[PDB]
A paper describes a structure:
GAPDH is a critical enzyme in the glycolysis pathway, and it mainly localizes in the cytoplasm. Malfunction of GAPDH lowers cellular energy generation and triggers cell death. GAPDH function is highly sensitive to the redox environment within the cell. Prolonged oxidative stress oxidizes GAPDH, which is subsequently translocated into the nucleus and initiates apoptosis.
We applied oxidative stress to genome-edited HEK293T cells and purified endogenous GAPDH from cytosol and nucleus separately after 8 and 24 h of oxidative stress. We further determined structures of cytosolic and nuclear GAPDH from oxidatively stressed cells. Interestingly, by analyzing structure of individual subunits from all GAPDH datasets, including the one without oxidative stress, we captured different conformations of the GAPDH catalytic site. In one conformation, there is a density connecting side chains of C152 and H179. Considering that this is the only conformation of the catalytic site we found in GAPDH without oxidative stress, we name it as the active subunit. In another conformation, which we only found in oxidatively damaged GAPDH, H179 is no longer connected to C152 but instead connected to N316 through a weak density and C152 has a bulky side chain density, as observed in oxidized cysteine found in other studies. Thus, this conformation likely represents the oxidatively damaged catalytic triad, in which oxidized C152 is no longer hydrogen bond with H179. We name this conformation as inactive subunit. By counting the numbers of two types of subunits in all structures, we observed an increase of catalytically inactive subunits in both cytoplasmic and nuclear GAPDH upon prolonged oxidative stress. In the cytoplasm, the fraction of GAPDH containing one inactive subunit increases from zero to ~10% after 8 h and ~20% after 24 h.
Author numbering:
A (entry chain C), B (entry chain A), C (entry chain B), D (entry chain D): 2 to 335
Amino acid sequence: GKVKVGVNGFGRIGRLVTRAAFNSGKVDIVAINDPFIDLNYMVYMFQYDSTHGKFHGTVKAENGKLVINGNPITIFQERDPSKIKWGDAGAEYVVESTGVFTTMEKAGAHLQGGAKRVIISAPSADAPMFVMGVNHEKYDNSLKIISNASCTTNCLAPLAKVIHDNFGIVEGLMTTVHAITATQKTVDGPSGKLWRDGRGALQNIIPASTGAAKAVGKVIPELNGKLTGMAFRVPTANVSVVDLTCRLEKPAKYDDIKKVVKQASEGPLKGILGYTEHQVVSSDFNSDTHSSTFDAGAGIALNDHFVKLISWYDNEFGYSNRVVDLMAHMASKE
Amino acid sequence: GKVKVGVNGFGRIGRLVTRAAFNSGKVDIVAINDPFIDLNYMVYMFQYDSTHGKFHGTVKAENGKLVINGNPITIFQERDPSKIKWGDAGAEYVVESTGVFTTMEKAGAHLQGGAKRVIISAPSADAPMFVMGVNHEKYDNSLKIISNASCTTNCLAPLAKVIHDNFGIVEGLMTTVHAITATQKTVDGPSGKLWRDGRGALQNIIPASTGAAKAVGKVIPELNGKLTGMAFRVPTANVSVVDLTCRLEKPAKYDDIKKVVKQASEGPLKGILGYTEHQVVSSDFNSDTHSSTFDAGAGIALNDHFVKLISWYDNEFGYSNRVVDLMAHMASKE
Amino acid sequence: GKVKVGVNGFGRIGRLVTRAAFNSGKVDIVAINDPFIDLNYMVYMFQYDSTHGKFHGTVKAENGKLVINGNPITIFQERDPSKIKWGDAGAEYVVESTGVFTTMEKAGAHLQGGAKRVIISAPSADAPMFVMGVNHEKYDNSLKIISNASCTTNCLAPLAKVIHDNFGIVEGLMTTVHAITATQKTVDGPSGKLWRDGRGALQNIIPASTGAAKAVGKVIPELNGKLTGMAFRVPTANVSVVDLTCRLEKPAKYDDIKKVVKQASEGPLKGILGYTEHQVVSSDFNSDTHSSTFDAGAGIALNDHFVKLISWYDNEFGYSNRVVDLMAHMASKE
Amino acid sequence: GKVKVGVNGFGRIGRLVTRAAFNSGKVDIVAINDPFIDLNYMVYMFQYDSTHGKFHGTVKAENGKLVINGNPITIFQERDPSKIKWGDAGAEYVVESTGVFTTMEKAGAHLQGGAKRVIISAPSADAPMFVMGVNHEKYDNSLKIISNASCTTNCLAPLAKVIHDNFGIVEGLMTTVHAITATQKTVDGPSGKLWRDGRGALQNIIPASTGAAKAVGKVIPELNGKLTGMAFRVPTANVSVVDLTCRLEKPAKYDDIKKVVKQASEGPLKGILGYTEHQVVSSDFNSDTHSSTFDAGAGIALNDHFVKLISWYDNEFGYSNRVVDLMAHMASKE
């Protein structure tokens, strides 16, 4: 019943997606492709994680196949995506997580190998974007290549949708305090395009830009041209926070905002948007599957039309779980 | 000619103030009071600094007096401020930096010891607030107890003043990414009032509140009731950044904002407000004496009436240098 | 059947001991004493942990009692240990974890309250020391006040015992790379006795001394006067590593050492001393209950009589689990 | 009079070598080669440093030449070392700091371009090794390709030489607590050979091996086959520490060791080996030009024949200054 999924690239996103798929069980992984990691290294990388701890289960290599919880997984080492025999392994959906094939033309090479549909775990210039709980009902099954946007967009979209539906956002600017990523340098190093990104990650705030706020307009058409922002990269490990400053049409006291956010988090957006009133910190959301958790006590309102909202999100676990959920919904809609 | 200054408390602020006074030479330190630090420990603490490096000069203890660059300094160990013989040591001005005597009544005990005026290096509930380059011309010499506000207020005030003068701020919300301070815990520890502040500083974002934006209204009367914000405490070492989101009356393209900020930084606010167009990071402002440096490339504008401005500031060196400058101006006005 | 245990002090060690007792179920906690933490703060502190994550269970306050997994716990706020009514709450054993009552006379005040035996979770000047798996068979039930030494001693004792039994250690020097603790300063701060310990923990190696190696001689009488060492405090979070350099009597190739260590870890010291041959790092031992894990690949041997052995240990979870195990063994011996 | 020096590669070592050469003035840099950094990026990278602060001087680009303090510097972008026109730029000595041409045959390609001698800033399999203050008198001018070993070897060699000369080391094992380097990963990443080195540098101790102790035997022939050790990589920034455990022939109390080390540091090894008795930490040696500083208070001695010695060293500034000093001595010997 569950759809067969193949993963391209065994980086951070690919490993986390495999972990989420095996933890939730909504889909079955049957093939992985990576031209620079061998089988034993794959076992070592999957077994041990610095951020999320040891894998809860059994992983081993046998007969040239990665066996996780007794499920053999075919391993490929092709560099050209058009040469990967996805159909032979039985994979129906393919997750493109390498981060280098983001356009529709580049990502469509996987279709030649026998895959039916391709999901891009990154923003795409021309592929359609879907965010779970916001516009995933727009999927009609006639699209072969889509996109899951990014972690920041997935965190910002549900809260922005609720706020716009209840009070009518007029314009907003977003600032996100982000954790370090794999593109940063351990010590001040060489950067070709972004000079700031080449500086030492352990001792530099390194202010950075981001197009997630713009992409929210793509996900929600009514908010097109009304959002934008930047980002800061602090020397933390896993958890990021989003800060949204927006102007509302209708008057909205902070208690009303809290009530509507809690109501949305309970019924319609259960498991996607969280709500908390405790004195939480960043480490309290490690390995949390929510796309975004609204922090009631951290926000502040200048008046009835000018507020600042704070939302937490795990940029590793939440995005992978959202990718798995999107694949499951796509399989159900088939 | 230079006024004689006595320092109460040898914490971070007191040590940095002494260092700034000896580096610039605008004032002379002639007495220090601390009931928990002895002479040899004082020499050790002043000589070595983890953030700003070794002191450039000579410091030693002789005859029960701290000698810095050949200048003897009287040392007191009184716990009650009313019992300190400030007049005997020749100190005219006293810097109250312990952080526990912030009200006018509590801080006035130093006057009984023979001091002429008292400067509080922290926000005060009832003492007048002065920020160098913003409203320091309002000092009239008839005030015996004043205040220098805080680092965040000193960073926000000049940029806000320039923006209000040129374009008429209507309302703004501020977010500051702050470095760790002495009030935080090395590991998750016990906190009586602020539960979030008791969590581990090395692994927690610990969102925190701040009244610096409100205090800007006190410093600039026209902006009363139009500013507010919060703060985030990231596990960095020394440098903080301020993010201001505001709505303007007159239309203002980003180039016009940059031009006016540069013009202000050059002539009127020279040495107080900086300007840069390079790809700088947080560590590039270590040991910088400016109150705030405008980052042209980091900001973003949604439209002609909604912008986000970014300013850097060293929360240790800049505040101490501002305190020294305020004391020098007070002495000149005498 | 399980003995009733009362905990004095709700610091890091006390909270971790309560967590270990509720996770393993070998003993039952029925009373906690802390004069500076109220009930709601206790619930907040127990529920959330930055290092070990959220508590797996339910914790709440009701009728002035802390309820964990449905088990009510009496709460005391006495400051004088002699005034705590341990007998009224039904507590038989008391764990003294405040770190200020370490002598037999000071720790014996708990006996006046009705407690039968007292266990000190820290080194004691005169109380007997017991390490699980090394000399815990020497407990004879006639002792009312004992000690569990420390984390470093608990890590060093089993490996040293095995090495001495198999090859006859002649003399050794130990170096431990330790994680930051609650006694360190978030930023360079004031230290009364240890000047080095007052420096900034996030940016300083802060070399420190330690008497754990000496205490190993107390635990193992044959090694008296043959061990000693120092420590380094690096800006990590939870996991520490011990490095032992020793000279052996009998010739011992590295393979023989590995074989004997593995054999000891399997049968006799199961669950106390671990063994691994993988390429592990410090974060791979987070929340590990072993007292020490031997790292086969990290060690090196100059010749047949001069070797360096490496052992990992979680200084928070392992010590608490050892305390619980010692209490269970004491109850069994009753 | 000063020799003309050309630098191959503008990495960390090359930039630090250029900075040291311009700060001390013992040599003149007249050419730099890097195929992946352009002129403007070179100016940006040289001007700003996260660890050592802003460059004290003026650096700018004009007419395709890097101008530092008014001295133009020719810039090359060749990838093949044999095609670099070292002779045209007037460079006599060439510093090979890329880390990929370490053998004599590979490093000799620079001779075809017109260079007279080549200095390798890294360990070499077959090139002769020289350490300033230990065996640099063995240079006879007939060698065209040599080596400066490494930072760890440069720290260990002088102290080991003094100890062997005064007391006769029999055998020793070394452990070094090292800071993070450019070869580490910002977050757990892919490592081809060293699996441990691919783990997250900000949250992992990552135990590592090192051949510096072995190379000490090459530098000091009498100690061949008597030294070896390993290393630990902690999440610090710049400063490392060396721990040496050795057995001595003659009896040696700790006071005698301190006296001999101080005497050596004063006269013969002035500026190479330091001596301190203060309560220093790692950050106190930032931007220190000494090869190694002996920490009197941190060491410990079990008996008269078994001691542990502690030495600090800046692995960035000290090595670069030693390279400059070696080049100056080579020029003088010409």
